[PDB]
User: Fold Interleukin-15 receptor alpha chain from Homo sapiens.
Amino acid sequence: ITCPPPMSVEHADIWVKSYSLYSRERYICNSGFKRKAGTSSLTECVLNKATNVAHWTTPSLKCIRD
Assistant:
């Protein structure tokens, strides 16, 4: 039980080599960028109780320098 590709964020990178059911990942930001005051980039493989496949939340993320 692996997940679909996490394709979100915008101003950030992630690496997760094999995914997993009920796995948490945070975005590394873009090259040097910081999370703005309050933004959360927690992409968690949450079981959507219908599709039987854990997908990757809805994280807003505002990675802006520095």
